[PDB]
Amino acid sequence: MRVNNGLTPQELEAYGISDVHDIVYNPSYDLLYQEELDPSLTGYERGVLTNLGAVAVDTGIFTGRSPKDKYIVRDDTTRDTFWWADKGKGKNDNKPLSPETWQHLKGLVTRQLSGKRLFVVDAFCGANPDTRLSVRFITEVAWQAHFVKNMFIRPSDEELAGFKPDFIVMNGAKCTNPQWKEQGLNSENFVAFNLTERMQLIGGTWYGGEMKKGMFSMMNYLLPLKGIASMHCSANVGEKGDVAVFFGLSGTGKTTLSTDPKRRLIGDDEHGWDDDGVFNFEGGCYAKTIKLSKEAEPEIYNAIRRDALLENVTVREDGTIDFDDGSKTENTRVSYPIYHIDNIVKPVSKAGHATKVIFLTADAFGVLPPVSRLTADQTQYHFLSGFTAKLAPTPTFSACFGAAFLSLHPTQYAEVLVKRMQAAGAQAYLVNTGWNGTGKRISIKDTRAIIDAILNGSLDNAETFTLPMFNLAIPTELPGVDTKILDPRNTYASPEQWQEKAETLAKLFIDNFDKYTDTPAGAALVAAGPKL
Ligand SMILES: Nc1ncnc2c1ncn2[C@@H]1O[C@H](COP(=O)(O)OP(=O)(O)OP(=O)(O)O)[C@@H](O)[C@H]1O
Ligand SMILES: O=C([O-])C(=O)[O-]
Ligand SMILES: [Mg+2]
């Protein structure tokens, strides 16, 4: 277990874990590679070697998060501050848990990990020492340890020297809860959090995303309370120091579009915004691999090598991967340490204040324009709305473009965001990476061209006009982009086709925003939304 930094069995005994004979502290990438490739492994622990040099694993019955199994202990520390599922007006997954049931779940996990060979990985959540969390991850599955090593900030030998955990996550994926029915829970699985004890317990599900998004939820709780923005976005910097953030729901393009060879990548999913600027919470990127194209996305493709971890992909007998196959799941992914991307911010993932705020959305209705410059009020309206539809039309409204990870009320996030934007004189833009009248998704080539026009200032100097109903300012023409697609009405046989669909989508926005009108501030924002 590494050098002068290891843990004693007496220390694990304090967490409630007993009889641990073999401890693997701070595992190296080489050891992880050996553990995963052990030919005697059976089941979901087993990994396979691909022709690209990266190991591939299957995450079990769960290939994505399970929000129905997410619980937060309601006590005197979280009672008056948490955005509870049974008290507010907005729908959320922050279901309350009694301290007594928590104790029951903690016993299940500690017993499951007792008498086992354990992996212990210490890491940081947050690039800044003043607001970061020192997290200790405990697991009995090698690839899960690999996932946290990739996704979180890897400490230096000196940092490990005086490492003191302020948050502990015990992954007991192999165990389940037989008393769930009598405890009023959703199922035998569970993803629980206790802010008094500062711990996260996982049971039944092997999916690594629970640990990643679980800690994101905790940052989303602590930071805003300190006046710091906690955002679900990707980010990069230009040579001039111009920072751009990209908000959006899953599959909208945060990871694909931020990985721009012309710009230095800061992060791809979770960032904070304080008095000094934007900073990454993580130490790696988590890319989607369905229908992955080497030609269209070379940087992400080249990141798939030894130390990267493929998930639920289909591998053929000859070691080759079939990226197009989504039989196991459409949520095929690969995690990798951030340095697998050549052009990144080093040695610390952070930069100055963002001046360009981009909201990405995949509109399956084919109504919204490819690009539009938003007003201050429209920015707040769309942020709270958090729109997207379908994949590859069913609407989805997720506040702040990430409601599933919010620990506080949505307006609290909007407040701090506006605060930071006004101070930096930031400008907002709405980008539709989705569909139009053709019934096909806009090309990644055209989308990248649009992003370039935003960053280089072409869009800010372009001649614009107003799109009816949504009242969005759209450019008459844009360098490197096809003029015909800029106006969504042009993609249909007749502008009346767009009209019918536009009215349908407009009504969906109006109905959804109705829950924010219970305050004078939210009532004033309705004027910023679409109007028949
Ligand atoms: N025009 C387009 N713009 C962006 N992505 C596109 C476009 N056309 C197809 N895609 C595909 O859509 C997906 C976008 O995924 P990406 O990983 O960027 O989503 P994300 O917003 O980062 O999701 P998550 O929040 O789950 O991490 C990729 O598979 C990408 O190849
Ligand atoms: O599971 C998720 O949504 C993730 O981590 O991207
Ligand atoms: Mg992503």
8 Å CB contact between 309 and 358 = no
Q: Is residue 220, in this structure, part of any structural domain at all?
A: yes
Range of the domain at 186: 6-42+68-227
Same domain, 195 and 244: no
Instruction: Say how far apart CA 45 and CA 38 lie, in whole Å.
Output: 10
Per the CB < 8 A criterion, the answer to whether 52 and 305 are in contact is yes
The span from the CA of 336 to the CA of 259, in Å, is 13
Q: What is the CATH number of the domain that holds 326?
A: 2.170.8.10
> How far is the C-alpha of 258 from the C-alpha of 263, rounded, in Å?
8
Ligand 1 center to 167 CA (angstroms) = 32
- Helical residues (DSSP H) of 127-225, grouped into ranges: 142-151, 157-161, 209-222
Catalytic residue among 232, 263, 350, 356: 232
Return the DSSP state at 4.
Answer: T
Q: Which two tokens stand for residue 245?
A: 């953030």
**Do 481 and 425 share a structural domain?**
yes
| Angle of CA points 448, 453, 455, to nearest 5° | 95
* 55 located within any domain: yes
Q: Is 447 in the pocket of ligand 1 (CB under 6 A)?
A: yes
| Active-site residue (options: 65, 288, 353, 489) | 65
Same structural domain for residues 37 and 50? no
DSSP bridge partners of 430: 359, 372
User: For atom 5 of ligand 2, which residue has the closest CA?
Assistant: 209
* 103 CB neighbour count, 10 Å cutoff: 12
Tell me how far apart the alpha carbons of residues 517 and 90 are, in angstroms, rounded to a whole number: 12
Of the candidates 132, 213, 263, 353, the residue annotated as catalytic is 213
Query: In this structure, is residue 80 part of a structural domain?
Result: yes
Please state, in angstroms and rounded to a whole number, the distance separating the CA atoms of residues 236 and 280: 10
CA distance 498 to 186: 42
Q: Which ligand 2 atom is nearest residue 209's CA?
A: 5
- Residue ending a domain, among 300, 321, 341, is 341
Q: How far apart are CA 7 and CA 370, in angstroms?
A: 54
Residue pair 99/110 in contact (Cβ under 8 Å)? The answer is no
Neighbouring C-beta atoms of residue 2, cutoff 10 Å:
15
Does the annotation mark 269 as catalytic?
A: yes
Same domain, 159 and 304: no
Is the domain of 142 the same as that of 289?
no
Q: How far away, in angstroms, is 233 Cα from ligand 3 center?
A: 9
Count of helix runs (H) and strand runs (E) in the chain: 14, 28
Structure tokens at 434: 């989705």
Residue 501 and residue 523 in one domain? yes
How many Cα atoms are found within 13 Å in the side-chain-facing hemisphere of 281? 29
Q: How far is the CA of 127 from the centre of ligand 1 (A)?
A: 25
Domain's final residue, options 303, 326, 341: 341
Q: Report residue 519 as tokens.
A: 């305050």
What span, in angstroms and rounded, lies between the C-alpha atoms of 515 and 532? 19
Beta bridge partners of 322: 314
In degrees to the nearest 10, what's the CA dihedral of 320, 323, 326, 327?
-10
In a domain, 307, yes or no: yes
Q: Is 248 near ligand 1, meaning CB less than 6 Å away?
A: yes
Going by the DSSP 8-state scheme, the letter that residue 92 receives in this structure is -
Task: List residues bridging with 429 in a β-sheet.
Answer: 358, 373
Q: Residues 279, 249: one domain?
A: yes
Residue with tokens 């040099």: 53
**In angstroms, rounded to a whole number, what is the distance separating the alpha carbons of residues 301 and 292?**
8
Q: State the CB neighbour count (10 A cutoff) for residue 391.
A: 15
Is 333 a known active-site residue?
yes
Q: Which of the 8 DSSP states describes residue 350?
A: B
Give catalytic status of residue 232 as yes or no: yes
Please check whether residues 181 and 267 belong to one and the same domain.
no
Q: Give me the sign of the Cα torsion angle 526, 528, 530, 532.
A: positive
Domain count, the chain: 3
Q: Are 278 and 350 in contact (CB under 8 A)?
A: yes
Angle at 127 between CA 123 and CA 132, to 5 degrees: 65
Instruction: Please tell me what resolution, in angstroms, this structure has.
Output: 1.8
Query: At 125, which CATH number?
Result: 3.40.449.10
Q: What tokens were used for 145?
A: 């340890």
Q: How far apart are CA 53 and CA 131, in angstroms?
A: 36
* Torsional class of 303: left (φ above 0), alpha (ψ -120 to 50), beta (otherwise): alpha
**Of 67, 75, 169, which is closest to residue 406 (Cα–Cα)?**
67
- CA pseudo-torsion sign 122, 126, 128, 134: negative
Which residues sit opposite 124 in a β-bridge?
134, 153
C-alpha span between 414 and 421 (Å, rounded)? 10
Name the catalytic one among 63, 101, 255, 361. 255
Does residue 462 form part of some domain? yes
Query: Quick one: 364 and 435 in the same domain?
Result: yes
Question: How far is Cα 232 from Cα 497, in angstroms, rounded to an integer?
Answer: 34
- Ligand 1 neighbourhood includes 288 CB (under 6 angstroms): yes
Could you give the angle at the alpha carbon of 213 between the alpha carbons of 207 and 216, nearest 5°? 155
Q: Do the domain assignments include residue 439?
A: yes
Write out the DSSP string of 226-254.
GT-EEE-EEEEE-TT--EEEEE--TTSSH
Structure tokens at 90: 């907005």
Q: Which whole-number Å values give the CA distances from 296 to 207, 267, 384, 445, 446, in the listed order?
A: 28, 20, 32, 8, 12
**Co-location of 242 and 357 in the same domain:** yes
Do 67 and 398 contact (CB within 8 A), yes or no? no
Name the β-bridge partners of 435: 441
d(C-alpha 330, C-alpha 134), whole Å: 33
Boundary of a domain, candidates 319, 341, 363:
341
Residue 277 CB–ligand 1 contact under 6 Å? no
Phi-psi region of 276 (alpha: psi -120 to 50; beta: other; left: phi over 0): alpha
CB 228 within 8 A of CB 273: yes
Kindly state whether residues 352 and 498 are assigned to the same domain.
yes
CB 433 less than 6 A from any atom of ligand 1: yes
Q: How many CB atoms lie within 10 A of CB 338?
A: 23
> Which residues neighbour 422 within 8 Å (Cβ) at sequence distance 6 or greater?
none
The sign one gets for the Cα dihedral 323, 329, 330, 334 is negative
Cα 197 to ligand 3 centroid, rounded to whole Å:
30
Q: For residue 360, how many other CB atoms are within 10 A of its CB? A: 26
For residue 35, count CB atoms less than 10 angstroms from its CB and return exposed for 0-12, middle for 13-18, buried for 19 or more.
Answer: buried
Residue 442 known to bind ligand: yes
In 3-state terms, what secondary structure has residue 246?
strand
Distance CA 152, CA 173 (A): 20
Q: Quick one: 484 exposed, middle or buried, by C-beta within 10 A (0-12, 13-18, 19+)?
A: exposed
Q: Which of 473, 472, 451 is nearest to 464 (CA)?
A: 473
Indicate whether 1 belongs to any domain.
Answer: no
Q: What is the CATH number of the domain that holds 257?
A: 3.90.228.20
Question: Is 322 in the same domain as 463?
Answer: no
Who's near 480: CB < 8 A, 6+ residues apart?
Answer: 449, 452, 453
In Å, the largest CA–CA distance within the chain is: 74
- Measured in Å, residue 255 CA sits from the centre of ligand 1 at 7
Strand order in the sheet with 229-231: 229-231, 271-273, 278-280
Residue 93 appears among annotated catalytic residues: no
Atom of ligand 2 nearest to the CA of 404: 3
| 250 belongs to the catalytic site | yes
